[PDB]
């Protein structure tokens, strides 16, 4: 079709499983974009459809904290998803690099994420795979803008209707309700936001074990705490939000909207 007509590729930015992301420019506009190139030829049509579903969802979502999709193109043997360019690498990488975030930075960061989650939810979309690996930083500076990525596992809900949408996500960040093979919805993303905030503050996750069966027994039982010395200095407000995010029953758990009104996010 018309991709190698309008854009021109430069350096590789990352490999995925089936994919390769590369900085590209729209040659008429002179506009930098990130281009995720996928192999049609290595993929059944069932999986062509799985991809055109990802693009459909990404284009309902115009938001300052969500990597916007500008175009989506089928050529012979390749597919091109044109995202906003984000040069500051994964949130994960920058957390490792800085060991942990200050409450002030962690708040500014989780706030932006919650905003993104809220917009997803009010547009009838649940991400089901929130983790710092799927959050790109605008730059590597200390209070940087964070946009949300990969809706490869994102689903469509009708209103607050819960349902069994299958067993999917990342084991660290899975909801009790999903492991328990109960029906679920928007709250699964707020559970993940719980995990991500915790990581953000002290540099490790509230649930971990090398043996996955134990990791799951941990999550189901709401088995997190705030160890010493490092959590002793951290405000009780910060703790409170995490406690309302890692509430084990999903109906008593805090919503994206409730979360954005919490003192620890909206103070002064």
């Amino acid at each position: 079709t018309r991709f190698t007509e309008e854009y021109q590729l430069f350096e590789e930015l990352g490999k995925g499983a089936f994919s390769v992301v590369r900085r590209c420019v729209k040659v008429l506009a002179g506009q930098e974009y990130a281009a995720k190139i996928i192999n049609t030829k290595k993929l059944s049509a069932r999986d062509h459809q799985k991809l055109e579903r990802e693009a459909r969802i990404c284009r309902l979502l115009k938001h300052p904290n969500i990597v916007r999709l500008h175009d989506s193109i089928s050529e012979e043997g390749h597919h091109y998803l044109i995202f906003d360019l984000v040069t500051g690498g994964e949130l994960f990488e920058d957390i490792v690099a800085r060991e942990y975030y200050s409450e002030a930075d962690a708040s500014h960061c989780i706030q932006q994420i919650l905003e993104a989650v809220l917009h997803c939810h009010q547009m009838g979309v649940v991400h089901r795979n929130l983790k710092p690996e799927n959050l790109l930083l605008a730059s590597k500076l200390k209070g940087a803008a964070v946009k949300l990525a990969d809706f490869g596992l994102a689903i469509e809900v009708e209103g607050e209707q819960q349902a069994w949408f299958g067993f999917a996500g990342t084991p660290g960040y899975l909801s009790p309700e999903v492991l328990r093979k109960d029906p679920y919805g928007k709250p699964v993303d707020l559970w993940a936001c719980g995990v991500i905030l915790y990581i953000l503050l002290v540099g490790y996750p509230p649930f971990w074990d090398e043996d996955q069966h134990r990791l799951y027994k941990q999550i189901k039982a709401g088995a997190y705490d705030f160890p010493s010395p490092e959590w002793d200095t951290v405000t009780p407000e910060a703790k409170d939000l995490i406690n309302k995010m890692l509430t084990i029953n999903p109906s008593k758990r805090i919503t994206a909207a409730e979360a954005l009104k919490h003192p620890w996010i909206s103070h002064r």
């Binding site: 957390i95 996500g169 990342t170 540099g203 490790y204 160890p227 010395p229 490092e230």
Partner: peptide, 19 residues
């Protein structure tokens, strides 16, 4: 195996594939 120290627990943080 991690110790009862902040420096130790920070090794529990690795990237994770999906499923």
């Amino acid at each position: 195996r991690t110790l009862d120290s902040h420096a130790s627990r920070m090794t529990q943080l690795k990237k994770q594939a999906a499923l």
